[PDB]
PDB file of C-alpha atoms in Angstrom:
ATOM      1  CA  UNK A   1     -31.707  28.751 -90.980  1.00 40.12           C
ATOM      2  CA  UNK A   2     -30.200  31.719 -92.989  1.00 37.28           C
ATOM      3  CA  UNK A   3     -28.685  33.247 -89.695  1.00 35.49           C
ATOM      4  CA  UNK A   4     -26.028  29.921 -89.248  1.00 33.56           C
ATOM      5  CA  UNK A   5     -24.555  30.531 -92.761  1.00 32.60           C
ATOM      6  CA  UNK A   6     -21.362  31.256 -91.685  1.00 34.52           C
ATOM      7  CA  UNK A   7     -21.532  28.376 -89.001  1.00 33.99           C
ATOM      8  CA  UNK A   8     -18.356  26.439 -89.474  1.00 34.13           C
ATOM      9  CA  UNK A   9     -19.229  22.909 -90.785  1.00 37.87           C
ATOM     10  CA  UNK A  10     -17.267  20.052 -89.365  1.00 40.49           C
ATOM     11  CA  UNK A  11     -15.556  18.478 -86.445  1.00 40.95           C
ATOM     12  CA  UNK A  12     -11.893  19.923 -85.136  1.00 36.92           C
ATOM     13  CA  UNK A  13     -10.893  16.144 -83.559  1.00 37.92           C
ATOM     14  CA  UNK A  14      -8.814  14.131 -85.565  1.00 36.96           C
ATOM     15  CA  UNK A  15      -8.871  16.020 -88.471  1.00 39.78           C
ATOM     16  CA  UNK A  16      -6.102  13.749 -90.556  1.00 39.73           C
ATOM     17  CA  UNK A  17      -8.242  10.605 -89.486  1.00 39.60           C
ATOM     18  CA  UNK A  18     -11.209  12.053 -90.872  1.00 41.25           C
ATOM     19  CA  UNK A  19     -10.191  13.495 -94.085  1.00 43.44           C
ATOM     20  CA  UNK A  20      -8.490   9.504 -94.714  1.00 42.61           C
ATOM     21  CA  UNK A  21     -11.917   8.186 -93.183  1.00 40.49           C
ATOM     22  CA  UNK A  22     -13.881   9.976 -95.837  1.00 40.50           C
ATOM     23  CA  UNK A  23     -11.656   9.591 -98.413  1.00 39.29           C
ATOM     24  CA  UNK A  24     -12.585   5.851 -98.272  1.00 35.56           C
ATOM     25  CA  UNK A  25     -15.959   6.573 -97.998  1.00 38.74           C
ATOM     26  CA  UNK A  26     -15.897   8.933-100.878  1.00 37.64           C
ATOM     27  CA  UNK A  27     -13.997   6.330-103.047  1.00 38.33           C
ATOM     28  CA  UNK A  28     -16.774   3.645-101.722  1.00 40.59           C
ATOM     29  CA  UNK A  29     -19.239   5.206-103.258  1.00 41.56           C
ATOM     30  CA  UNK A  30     -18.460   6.449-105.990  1.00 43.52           C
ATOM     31  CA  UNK A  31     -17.309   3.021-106.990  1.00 40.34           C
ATOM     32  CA  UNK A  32     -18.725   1.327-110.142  1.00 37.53           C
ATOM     33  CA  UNK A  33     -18.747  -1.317-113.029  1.00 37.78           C
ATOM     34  CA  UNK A  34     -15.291  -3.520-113.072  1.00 39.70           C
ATOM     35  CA  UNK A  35     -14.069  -1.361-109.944  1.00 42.61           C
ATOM     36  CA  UNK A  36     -16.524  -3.013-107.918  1.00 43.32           C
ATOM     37  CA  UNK A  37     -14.046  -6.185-108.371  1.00 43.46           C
ATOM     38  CA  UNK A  38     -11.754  -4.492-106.530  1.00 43.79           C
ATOM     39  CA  UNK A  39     -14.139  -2.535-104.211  1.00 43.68           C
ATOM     40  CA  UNK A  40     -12.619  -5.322-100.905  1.00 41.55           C
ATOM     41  CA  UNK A  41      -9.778  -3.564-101.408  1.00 39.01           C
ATOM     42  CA  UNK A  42     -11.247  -0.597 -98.989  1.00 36.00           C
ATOM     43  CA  UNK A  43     -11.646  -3.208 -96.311  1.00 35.28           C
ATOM     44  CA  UNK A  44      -9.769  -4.506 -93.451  1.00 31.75           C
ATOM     45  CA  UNK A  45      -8.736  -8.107 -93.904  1.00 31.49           C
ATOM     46  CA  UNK A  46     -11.617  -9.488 -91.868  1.00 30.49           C
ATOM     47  CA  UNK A  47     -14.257  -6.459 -92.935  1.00 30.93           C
ATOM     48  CA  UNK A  48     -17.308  -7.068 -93.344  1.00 31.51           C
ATOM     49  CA  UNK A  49     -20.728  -5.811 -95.386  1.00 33.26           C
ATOM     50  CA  UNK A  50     -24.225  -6.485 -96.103  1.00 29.77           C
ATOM     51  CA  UNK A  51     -27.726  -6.067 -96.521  1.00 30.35           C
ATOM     52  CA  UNK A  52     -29.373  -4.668 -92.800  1.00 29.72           C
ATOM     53  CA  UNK A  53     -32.890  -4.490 -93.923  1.00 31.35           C
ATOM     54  CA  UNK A  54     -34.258  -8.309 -95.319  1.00 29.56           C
ATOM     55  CA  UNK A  55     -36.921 -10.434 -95.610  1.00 29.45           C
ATOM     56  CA  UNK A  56     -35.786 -12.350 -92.903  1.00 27.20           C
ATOM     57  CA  UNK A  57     -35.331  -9.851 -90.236  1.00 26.95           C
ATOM     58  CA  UNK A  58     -31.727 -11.281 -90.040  1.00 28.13           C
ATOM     59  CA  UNK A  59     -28.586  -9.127 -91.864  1.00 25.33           C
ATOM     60  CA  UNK A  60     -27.390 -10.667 -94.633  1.00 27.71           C
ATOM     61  CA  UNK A  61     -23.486 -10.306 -93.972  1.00 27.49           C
ATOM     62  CA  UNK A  62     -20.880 -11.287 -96.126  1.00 26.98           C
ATOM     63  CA  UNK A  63     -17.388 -11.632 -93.831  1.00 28.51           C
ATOM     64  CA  UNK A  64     -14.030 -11.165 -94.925  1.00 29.19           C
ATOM     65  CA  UNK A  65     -12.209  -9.839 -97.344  1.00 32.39           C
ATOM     66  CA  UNK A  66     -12.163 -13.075 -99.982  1.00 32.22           C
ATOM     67  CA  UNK A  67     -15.709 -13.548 -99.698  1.00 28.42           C
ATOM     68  CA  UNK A  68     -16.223  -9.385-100.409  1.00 27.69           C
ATOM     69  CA  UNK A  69     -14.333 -10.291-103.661  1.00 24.92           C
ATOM     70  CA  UNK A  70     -16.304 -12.791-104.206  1.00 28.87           C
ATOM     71  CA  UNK A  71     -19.190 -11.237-103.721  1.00 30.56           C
ATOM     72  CA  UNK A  72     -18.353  -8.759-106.193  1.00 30.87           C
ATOM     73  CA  UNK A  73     -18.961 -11.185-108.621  1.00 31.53           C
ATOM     74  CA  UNK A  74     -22.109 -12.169-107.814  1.00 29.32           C
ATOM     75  CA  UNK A  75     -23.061  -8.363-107.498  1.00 27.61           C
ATOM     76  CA  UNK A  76     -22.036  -7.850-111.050  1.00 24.85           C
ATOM     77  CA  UNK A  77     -23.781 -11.074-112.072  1.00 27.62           C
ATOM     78  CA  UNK A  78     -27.107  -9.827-110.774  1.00 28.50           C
ATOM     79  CA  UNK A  79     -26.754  -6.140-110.824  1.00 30.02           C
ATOM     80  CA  UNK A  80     -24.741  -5.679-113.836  1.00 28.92           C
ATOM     81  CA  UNK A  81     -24.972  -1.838-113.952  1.00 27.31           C
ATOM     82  CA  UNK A  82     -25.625  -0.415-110.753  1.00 31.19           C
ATOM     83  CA  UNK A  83     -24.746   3.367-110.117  1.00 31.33           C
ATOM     84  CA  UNK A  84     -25.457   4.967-106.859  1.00 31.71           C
ATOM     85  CA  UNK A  85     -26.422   8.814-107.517  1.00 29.13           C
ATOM     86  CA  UNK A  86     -27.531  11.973-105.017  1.00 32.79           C
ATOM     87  CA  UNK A  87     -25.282  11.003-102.741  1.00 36.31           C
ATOM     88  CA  UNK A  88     -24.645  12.999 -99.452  1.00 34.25           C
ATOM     89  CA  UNK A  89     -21.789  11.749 -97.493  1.00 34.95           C
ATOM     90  CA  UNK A  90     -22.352  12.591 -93.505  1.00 30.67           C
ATOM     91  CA  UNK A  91     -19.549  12.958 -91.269  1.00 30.36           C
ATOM     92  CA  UNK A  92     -19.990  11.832 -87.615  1.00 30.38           C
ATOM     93  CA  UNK A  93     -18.871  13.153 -84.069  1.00 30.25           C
ATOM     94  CA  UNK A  94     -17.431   9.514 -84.384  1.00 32.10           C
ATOM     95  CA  UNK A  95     -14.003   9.988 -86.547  1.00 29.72           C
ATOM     96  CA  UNK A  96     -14.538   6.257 -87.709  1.00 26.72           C
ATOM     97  CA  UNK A  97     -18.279   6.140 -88.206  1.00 26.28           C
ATOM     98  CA  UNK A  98     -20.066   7.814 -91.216  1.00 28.13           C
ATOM     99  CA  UNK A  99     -23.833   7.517 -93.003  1.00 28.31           C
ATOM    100  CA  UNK A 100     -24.400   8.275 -96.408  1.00 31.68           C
ATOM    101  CA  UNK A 101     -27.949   8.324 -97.840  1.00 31.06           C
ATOM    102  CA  UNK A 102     -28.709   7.926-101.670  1.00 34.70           C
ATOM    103  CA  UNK A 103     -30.042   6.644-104.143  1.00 39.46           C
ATOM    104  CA  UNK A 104     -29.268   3.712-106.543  1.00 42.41           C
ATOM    105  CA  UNK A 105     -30.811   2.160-109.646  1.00 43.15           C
ATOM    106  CA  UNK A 106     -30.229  -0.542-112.658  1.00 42.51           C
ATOM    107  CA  UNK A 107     -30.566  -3.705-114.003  1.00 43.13           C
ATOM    108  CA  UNK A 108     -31.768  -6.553-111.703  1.00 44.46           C
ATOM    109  CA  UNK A 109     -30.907 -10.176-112.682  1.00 41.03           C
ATOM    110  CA  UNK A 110     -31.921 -12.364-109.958  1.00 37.84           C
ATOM    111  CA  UNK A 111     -32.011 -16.326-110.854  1.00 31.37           C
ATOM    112  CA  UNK A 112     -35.986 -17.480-110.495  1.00 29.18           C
ATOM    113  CA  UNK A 113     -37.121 -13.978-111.337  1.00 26.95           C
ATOM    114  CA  UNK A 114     -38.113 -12.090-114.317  1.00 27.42           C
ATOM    115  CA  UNK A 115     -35.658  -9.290-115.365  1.00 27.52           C
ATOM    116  CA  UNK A 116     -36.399  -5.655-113.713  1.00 23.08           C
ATOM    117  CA  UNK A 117     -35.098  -2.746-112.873  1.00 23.66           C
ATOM    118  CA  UNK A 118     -34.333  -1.693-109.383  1.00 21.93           C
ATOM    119  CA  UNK A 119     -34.710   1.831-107.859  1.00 20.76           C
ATOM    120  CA  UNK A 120     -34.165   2.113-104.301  1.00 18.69           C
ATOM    121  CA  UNK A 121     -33.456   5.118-101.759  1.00 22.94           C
ATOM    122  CA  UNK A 122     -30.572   3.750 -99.166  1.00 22.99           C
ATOM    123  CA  UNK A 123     -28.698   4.826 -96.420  1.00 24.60           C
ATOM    124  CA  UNK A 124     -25.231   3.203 -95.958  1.00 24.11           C
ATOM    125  CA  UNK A 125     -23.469   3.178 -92.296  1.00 23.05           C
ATOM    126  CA  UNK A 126     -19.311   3.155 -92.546  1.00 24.23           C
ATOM    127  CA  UNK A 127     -17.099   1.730 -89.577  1.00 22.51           C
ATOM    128  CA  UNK A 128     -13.811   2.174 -90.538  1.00 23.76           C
ATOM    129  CA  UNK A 129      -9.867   1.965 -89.225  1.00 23.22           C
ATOM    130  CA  UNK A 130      -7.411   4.338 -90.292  1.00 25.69           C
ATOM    131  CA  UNK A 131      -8.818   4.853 -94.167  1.00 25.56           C
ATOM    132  CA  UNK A 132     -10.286   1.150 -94.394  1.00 22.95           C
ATOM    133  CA  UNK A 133     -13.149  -0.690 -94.138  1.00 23.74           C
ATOM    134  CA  UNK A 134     -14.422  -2.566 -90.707  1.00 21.52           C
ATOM    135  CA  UNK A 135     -18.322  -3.036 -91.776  1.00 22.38           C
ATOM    136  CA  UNK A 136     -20.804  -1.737 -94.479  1.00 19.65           C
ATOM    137  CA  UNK A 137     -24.320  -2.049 -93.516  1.00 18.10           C
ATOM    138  CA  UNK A 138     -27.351  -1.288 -96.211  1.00 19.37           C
ATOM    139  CA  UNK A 139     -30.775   0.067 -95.163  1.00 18.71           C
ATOM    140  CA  UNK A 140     -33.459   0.701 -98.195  1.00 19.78           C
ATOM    141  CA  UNK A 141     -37.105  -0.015 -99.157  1.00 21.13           C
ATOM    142  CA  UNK A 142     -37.754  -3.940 -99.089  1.00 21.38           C
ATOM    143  CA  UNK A 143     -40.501  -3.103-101.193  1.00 22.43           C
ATOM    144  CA  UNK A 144     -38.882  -1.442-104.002  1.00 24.45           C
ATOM    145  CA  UNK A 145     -37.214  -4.589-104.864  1.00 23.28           C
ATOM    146  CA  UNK A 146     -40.433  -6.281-104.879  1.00 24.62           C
ATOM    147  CA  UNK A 147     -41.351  -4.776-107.204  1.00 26.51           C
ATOM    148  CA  UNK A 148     -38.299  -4.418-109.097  1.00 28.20           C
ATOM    149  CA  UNK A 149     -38.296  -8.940-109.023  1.00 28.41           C
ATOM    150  CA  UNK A 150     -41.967  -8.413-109.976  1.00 27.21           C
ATOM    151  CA  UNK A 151     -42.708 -10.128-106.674  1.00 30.81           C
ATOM    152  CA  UNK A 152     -46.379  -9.019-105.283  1.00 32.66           C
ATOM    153  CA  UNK A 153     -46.712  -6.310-102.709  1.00 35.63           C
ATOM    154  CA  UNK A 154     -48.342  -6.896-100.054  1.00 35.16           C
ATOM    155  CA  UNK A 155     -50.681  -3.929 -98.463  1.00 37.89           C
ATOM    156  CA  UNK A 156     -51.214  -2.583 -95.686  1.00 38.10           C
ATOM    157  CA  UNK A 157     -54.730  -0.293 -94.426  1.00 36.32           C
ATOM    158  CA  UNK A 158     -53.630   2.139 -91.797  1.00 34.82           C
ATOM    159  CA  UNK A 159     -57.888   3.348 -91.285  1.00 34.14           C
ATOM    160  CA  UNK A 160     -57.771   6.032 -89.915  1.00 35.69           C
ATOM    161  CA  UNK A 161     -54.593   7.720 -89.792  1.00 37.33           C
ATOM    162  CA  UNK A 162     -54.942  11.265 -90.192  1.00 34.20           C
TER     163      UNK A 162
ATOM    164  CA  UNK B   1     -16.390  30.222 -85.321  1.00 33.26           C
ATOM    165  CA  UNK B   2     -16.327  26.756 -84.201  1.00 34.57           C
ATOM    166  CA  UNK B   3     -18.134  27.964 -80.806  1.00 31.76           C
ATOM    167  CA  UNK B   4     -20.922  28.887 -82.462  1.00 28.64           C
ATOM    168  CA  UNK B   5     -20.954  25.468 -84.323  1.00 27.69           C
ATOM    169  CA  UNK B   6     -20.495  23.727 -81.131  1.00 26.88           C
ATOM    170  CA  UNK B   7     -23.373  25.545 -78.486  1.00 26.91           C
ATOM    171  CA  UNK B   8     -25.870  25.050 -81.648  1.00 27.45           C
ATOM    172  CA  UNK B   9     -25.188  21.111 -82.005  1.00 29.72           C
ATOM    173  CA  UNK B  10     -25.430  20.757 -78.183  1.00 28.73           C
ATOM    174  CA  UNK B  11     -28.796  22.240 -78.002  1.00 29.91           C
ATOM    175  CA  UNK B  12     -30.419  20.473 -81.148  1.00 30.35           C
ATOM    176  CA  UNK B  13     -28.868  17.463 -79.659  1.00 31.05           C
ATOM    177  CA  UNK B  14     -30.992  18.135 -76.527  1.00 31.03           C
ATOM    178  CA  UNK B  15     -34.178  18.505 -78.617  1.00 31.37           C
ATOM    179  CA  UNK B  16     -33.359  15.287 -80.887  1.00 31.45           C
ATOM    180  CA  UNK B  17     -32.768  13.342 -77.130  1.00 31.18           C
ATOM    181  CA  UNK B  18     -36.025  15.032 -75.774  1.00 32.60           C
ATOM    182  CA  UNK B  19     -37.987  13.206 -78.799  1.00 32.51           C
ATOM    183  CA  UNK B  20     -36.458   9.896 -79.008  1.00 30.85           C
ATOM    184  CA  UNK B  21     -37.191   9.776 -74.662  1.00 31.06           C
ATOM    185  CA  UNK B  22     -40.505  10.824 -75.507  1.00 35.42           C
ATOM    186  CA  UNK B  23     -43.372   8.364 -74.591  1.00 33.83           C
ATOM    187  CA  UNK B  24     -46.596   7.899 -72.959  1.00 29.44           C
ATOM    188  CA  UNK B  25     -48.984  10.185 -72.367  1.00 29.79           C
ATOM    189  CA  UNK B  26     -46.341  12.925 -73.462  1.00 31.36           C
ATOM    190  CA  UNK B  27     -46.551  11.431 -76.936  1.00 31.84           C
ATOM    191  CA  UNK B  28     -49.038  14.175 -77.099  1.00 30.23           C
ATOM    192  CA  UNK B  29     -46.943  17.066 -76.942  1.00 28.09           C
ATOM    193  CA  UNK B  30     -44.334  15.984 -79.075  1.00 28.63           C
ATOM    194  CA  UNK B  31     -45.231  18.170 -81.856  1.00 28.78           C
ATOM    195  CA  UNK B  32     -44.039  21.004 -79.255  1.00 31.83           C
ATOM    196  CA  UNK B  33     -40.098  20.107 -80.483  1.00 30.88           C
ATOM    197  CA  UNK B  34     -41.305  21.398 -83.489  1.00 30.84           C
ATOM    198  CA  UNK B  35     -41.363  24.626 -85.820  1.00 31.79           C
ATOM    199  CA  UNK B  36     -44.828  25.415 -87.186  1.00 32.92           C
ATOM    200  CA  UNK B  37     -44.260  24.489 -90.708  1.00 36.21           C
ATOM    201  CA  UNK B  38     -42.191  21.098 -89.153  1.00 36.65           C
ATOM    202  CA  UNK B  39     -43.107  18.028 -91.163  1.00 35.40           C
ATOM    203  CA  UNK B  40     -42.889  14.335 -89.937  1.00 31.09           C
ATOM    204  CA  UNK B  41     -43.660  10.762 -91.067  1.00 28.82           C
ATOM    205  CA  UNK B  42     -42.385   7.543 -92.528  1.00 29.24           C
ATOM    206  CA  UNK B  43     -40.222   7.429 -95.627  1.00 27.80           C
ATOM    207  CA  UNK B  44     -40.240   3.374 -96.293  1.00 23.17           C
ATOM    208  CA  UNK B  45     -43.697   3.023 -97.163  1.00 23.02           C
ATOM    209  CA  UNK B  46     -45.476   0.259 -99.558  1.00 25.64           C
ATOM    210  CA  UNK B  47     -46.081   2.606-102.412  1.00 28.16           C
ATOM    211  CA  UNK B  48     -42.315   4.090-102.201  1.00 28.21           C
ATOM    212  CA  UNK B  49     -44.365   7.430-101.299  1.00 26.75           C
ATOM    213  CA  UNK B  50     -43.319   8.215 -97.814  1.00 29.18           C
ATOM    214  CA  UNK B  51     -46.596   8.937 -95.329  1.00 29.64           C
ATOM    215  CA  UNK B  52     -45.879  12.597 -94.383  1.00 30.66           C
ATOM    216  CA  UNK B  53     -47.211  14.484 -91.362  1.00 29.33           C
ATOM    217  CA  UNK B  54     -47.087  18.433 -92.551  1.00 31.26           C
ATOM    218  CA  UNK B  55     -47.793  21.218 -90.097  1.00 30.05           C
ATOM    219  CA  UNK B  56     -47.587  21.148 -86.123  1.00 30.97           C
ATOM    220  CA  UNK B  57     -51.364  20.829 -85.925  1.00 27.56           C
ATOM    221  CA  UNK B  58     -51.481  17.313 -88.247  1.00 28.13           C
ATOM    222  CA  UNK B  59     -48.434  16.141 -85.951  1.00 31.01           C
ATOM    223  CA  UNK B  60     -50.374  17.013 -83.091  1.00 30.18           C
ATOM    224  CA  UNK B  61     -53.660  14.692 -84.395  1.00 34.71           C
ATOM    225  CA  UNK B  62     -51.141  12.042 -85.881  1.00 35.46           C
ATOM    226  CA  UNK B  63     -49.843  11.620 -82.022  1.00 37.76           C
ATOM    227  CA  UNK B  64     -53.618  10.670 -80.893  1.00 40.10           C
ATOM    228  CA  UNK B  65     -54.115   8.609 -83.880  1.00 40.17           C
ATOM    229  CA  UNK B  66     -50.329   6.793 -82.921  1.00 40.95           C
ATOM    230  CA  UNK B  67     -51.269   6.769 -78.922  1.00 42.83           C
ATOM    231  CA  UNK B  68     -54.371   4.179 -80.147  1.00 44.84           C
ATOM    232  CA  UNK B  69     -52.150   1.947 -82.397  1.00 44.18           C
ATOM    233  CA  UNK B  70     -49.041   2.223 -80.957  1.00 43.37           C
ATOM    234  CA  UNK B  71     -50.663   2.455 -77.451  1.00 44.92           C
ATOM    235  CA  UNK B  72     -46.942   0.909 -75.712  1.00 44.67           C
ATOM    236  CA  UNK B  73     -44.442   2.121 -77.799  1.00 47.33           C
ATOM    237  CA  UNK B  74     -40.890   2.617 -77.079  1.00 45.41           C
ATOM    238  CA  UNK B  75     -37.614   3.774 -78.624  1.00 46.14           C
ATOM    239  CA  UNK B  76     -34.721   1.433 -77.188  1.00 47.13           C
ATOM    240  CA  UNK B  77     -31.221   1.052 -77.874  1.00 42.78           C
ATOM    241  CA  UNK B  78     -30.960   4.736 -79.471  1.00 42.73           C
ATOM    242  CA  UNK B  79     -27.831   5.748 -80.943  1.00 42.86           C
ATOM    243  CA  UNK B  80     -27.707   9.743 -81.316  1.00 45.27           C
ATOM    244  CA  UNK B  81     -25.223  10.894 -84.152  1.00 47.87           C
ATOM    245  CA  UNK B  82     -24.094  14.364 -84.820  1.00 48.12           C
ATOM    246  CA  UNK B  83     -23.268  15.352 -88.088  1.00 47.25           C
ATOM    247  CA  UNK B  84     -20.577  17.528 -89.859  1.00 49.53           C
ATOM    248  CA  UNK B  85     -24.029  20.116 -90.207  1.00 51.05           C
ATOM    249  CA  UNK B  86     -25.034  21.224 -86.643  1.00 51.83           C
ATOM    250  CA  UNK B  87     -28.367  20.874 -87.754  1.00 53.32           C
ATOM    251  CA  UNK B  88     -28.561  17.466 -88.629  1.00 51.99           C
ATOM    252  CA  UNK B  89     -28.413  14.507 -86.550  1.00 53.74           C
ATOM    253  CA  UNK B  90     -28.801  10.433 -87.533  1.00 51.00           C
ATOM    254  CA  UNK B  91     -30.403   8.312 -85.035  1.00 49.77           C
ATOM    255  CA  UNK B  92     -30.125   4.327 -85.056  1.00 51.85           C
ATOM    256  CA  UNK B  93     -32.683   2.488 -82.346  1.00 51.51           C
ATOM    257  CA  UNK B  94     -34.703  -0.435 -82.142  1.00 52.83           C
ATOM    258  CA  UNK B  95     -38.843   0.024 -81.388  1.00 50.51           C
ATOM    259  CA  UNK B  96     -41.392  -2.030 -80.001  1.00 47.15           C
ATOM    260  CA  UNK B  97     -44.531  -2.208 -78.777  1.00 50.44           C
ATOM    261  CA  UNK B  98     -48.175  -3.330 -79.671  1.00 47.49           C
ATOM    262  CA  UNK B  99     -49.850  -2.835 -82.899  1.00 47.83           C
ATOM    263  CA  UNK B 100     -53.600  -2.404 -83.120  1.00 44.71           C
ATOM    264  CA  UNK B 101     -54.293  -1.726 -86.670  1.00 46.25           C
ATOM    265  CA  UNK B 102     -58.413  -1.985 -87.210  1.00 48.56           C
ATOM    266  CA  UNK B 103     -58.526  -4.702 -89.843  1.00 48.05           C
ATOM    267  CA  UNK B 104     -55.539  -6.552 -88.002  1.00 50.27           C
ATOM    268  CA  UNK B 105     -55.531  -8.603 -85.429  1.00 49.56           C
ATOM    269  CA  UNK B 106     -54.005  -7.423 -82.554  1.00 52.38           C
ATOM    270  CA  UNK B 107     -50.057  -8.368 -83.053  1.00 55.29           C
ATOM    271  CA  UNK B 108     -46.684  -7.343 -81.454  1.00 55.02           C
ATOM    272  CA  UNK B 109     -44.591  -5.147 -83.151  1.00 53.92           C
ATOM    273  CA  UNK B 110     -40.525  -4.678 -83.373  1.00 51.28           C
ATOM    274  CA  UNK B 111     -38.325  -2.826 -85.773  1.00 49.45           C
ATOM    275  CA  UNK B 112     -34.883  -1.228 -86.059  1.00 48.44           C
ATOM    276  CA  UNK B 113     -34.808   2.355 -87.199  1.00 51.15           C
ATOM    277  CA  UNK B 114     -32.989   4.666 -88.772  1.00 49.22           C
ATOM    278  CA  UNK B 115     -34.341   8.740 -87.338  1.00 44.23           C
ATOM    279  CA  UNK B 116     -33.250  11.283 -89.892  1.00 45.78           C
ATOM    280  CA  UNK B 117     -33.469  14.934 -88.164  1.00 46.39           C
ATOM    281  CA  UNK B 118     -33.363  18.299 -89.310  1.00 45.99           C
ATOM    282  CA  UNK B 119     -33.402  21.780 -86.857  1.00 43.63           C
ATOM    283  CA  UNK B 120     -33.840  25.375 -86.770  1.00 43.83           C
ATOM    284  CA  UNK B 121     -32.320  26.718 -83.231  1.00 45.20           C
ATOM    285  CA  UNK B 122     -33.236  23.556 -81.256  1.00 42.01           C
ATOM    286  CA  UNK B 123     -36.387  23.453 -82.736  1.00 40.37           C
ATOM    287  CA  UNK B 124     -37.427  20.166 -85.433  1.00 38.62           C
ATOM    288  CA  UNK B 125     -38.170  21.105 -88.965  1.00 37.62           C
ATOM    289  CA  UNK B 126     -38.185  17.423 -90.315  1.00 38.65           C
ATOM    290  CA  UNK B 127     -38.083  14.032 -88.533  1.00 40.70           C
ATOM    291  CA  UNK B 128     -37.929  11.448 -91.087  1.00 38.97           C
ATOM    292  CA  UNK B 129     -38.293   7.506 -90.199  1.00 37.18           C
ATOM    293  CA  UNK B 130     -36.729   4.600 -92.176  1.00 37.54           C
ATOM    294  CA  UNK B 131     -37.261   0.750 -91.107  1.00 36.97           C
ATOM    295  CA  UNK B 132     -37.460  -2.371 -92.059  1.00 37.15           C
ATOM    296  CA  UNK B 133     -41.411  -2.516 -93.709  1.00 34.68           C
ATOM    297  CA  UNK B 134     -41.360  -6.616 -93.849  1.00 32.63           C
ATOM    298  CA  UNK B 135     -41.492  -6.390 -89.710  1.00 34.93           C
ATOM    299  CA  UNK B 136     -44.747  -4.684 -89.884  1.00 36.26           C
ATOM    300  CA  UNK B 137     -45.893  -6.799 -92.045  1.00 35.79           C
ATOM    301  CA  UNK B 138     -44.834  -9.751 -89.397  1.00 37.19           C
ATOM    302  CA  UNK B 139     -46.645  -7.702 -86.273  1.00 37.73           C
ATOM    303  CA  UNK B 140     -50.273  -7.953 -88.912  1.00 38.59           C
ATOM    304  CA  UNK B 141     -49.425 -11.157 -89.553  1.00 36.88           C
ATOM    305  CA  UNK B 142     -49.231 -10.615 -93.312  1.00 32.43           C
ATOM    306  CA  UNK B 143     -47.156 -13.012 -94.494  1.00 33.05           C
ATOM    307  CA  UNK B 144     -44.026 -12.332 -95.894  1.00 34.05           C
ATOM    308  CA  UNK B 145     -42.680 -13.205 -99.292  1.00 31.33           C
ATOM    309  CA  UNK B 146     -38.676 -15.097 -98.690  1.00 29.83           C
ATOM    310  CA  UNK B 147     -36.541 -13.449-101.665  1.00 28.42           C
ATOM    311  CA  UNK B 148     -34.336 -16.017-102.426  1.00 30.60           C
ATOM    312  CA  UNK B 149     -30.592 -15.014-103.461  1.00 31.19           C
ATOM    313  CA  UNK B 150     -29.356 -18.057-105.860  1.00 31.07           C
ATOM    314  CA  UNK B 151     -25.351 -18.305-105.252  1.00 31.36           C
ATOM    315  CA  UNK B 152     -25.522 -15.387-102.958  1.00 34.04           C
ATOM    316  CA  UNK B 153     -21.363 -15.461-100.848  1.00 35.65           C
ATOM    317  CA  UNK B 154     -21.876 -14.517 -97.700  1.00 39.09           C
TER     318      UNK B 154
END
């Protein structure tokens, strides 16, 4: 509340770690168009990223640094201009761990579905090692791509909820 | 000074602990962790509105309505995370329990969360709760669409 306005913000542990932590982070997200080629190059060798909330239950994880390049491709392919936007970067009491929540929007291309466009609220969870990249994990709506693949929604009554 | 900082993220960390422990019959009270005005609720929703619980009172009659449907249910796994703001914490867990939805039959229900959590002096302002919405649909045994990724590397 306005009393804690002059509360320091911040952690005073590895301060150099976190600044390089964050860096990455920072760089992460603010990645786009042919960057996002070249987006691996944040990771450790055998880093890893993906998709936490799916269909399946299941992540969707793409493993190692080759196959996060060439993933890239198939991100551009399908999500030709994707920009994240209000982004709020959240440091941890964990040096090496960090969550950012925003939002992200564009074009979505999937093969076997009708053109759309994609608007989803996510949060993203960082592991890194000194300034690079151990695993990216996405969490957003499942049903806001649905839509966005013009797929049907299913509902669901909650009677009675207040 | 950093003292300061550090007494006021200890005790909101108490009252963010307190909640995500909180179960049973003390479901009830949970709105007590809260300021008057503190809001609650579920921000990955069907309609991309989230479902929000406004005022200590509504939180208070949501709990009753959430005791019947969610008669069982548990916070597991829970991974508390302090922030760079004293008054905001990030929890990860996993929940389960039954789900007795009228209109549904009577199902089993997991999911793996994401708690966001704002405070005022140890006191809740805004609990907001992100999951994965296609494992509710699985506990009403709606069936799920399979989006299929052509050429997806994984």
């Amino acid at each position: 509340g306005m009393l804690d306005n002059a509360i320091p913000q911040g952690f005073e542990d590895a301060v150099e770690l976190r600044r390089k932590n964050r860096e990455t982070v920072v760089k992460y997200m603010n990645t786009k168009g042919q960057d996002r080629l070249r987006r691996h190059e944040l990771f450790v060798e055998d880093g890893c990223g993906g998709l936490w909330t799916t269909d399946t239950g299941s992540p969707i994880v793409i493993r190692g640094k080759d196959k996060l390049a060439e993933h890239a491709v198939w991100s551009l392919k399908c999500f030709p201009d994707w920009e994240w936007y209000n982004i709020k970067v959240f440091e941890t009491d964990d040096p090496n761990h960090f969550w950012v929540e925003c939002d992200g929007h564009g074009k979505i291309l999937f093969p076997g579905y009708p053109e759309g466009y994609y608007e989803n609220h996510f949060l993203h969870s960082f592991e890194l090692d000194d300034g690079k990249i151990k695993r990216n994990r996405e969490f957003m709506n499942v049903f806001q791509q649905l839509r966005a693949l013009s797929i049907p929604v299913p509902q669901i009554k909650r009677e009675g909820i207040p």
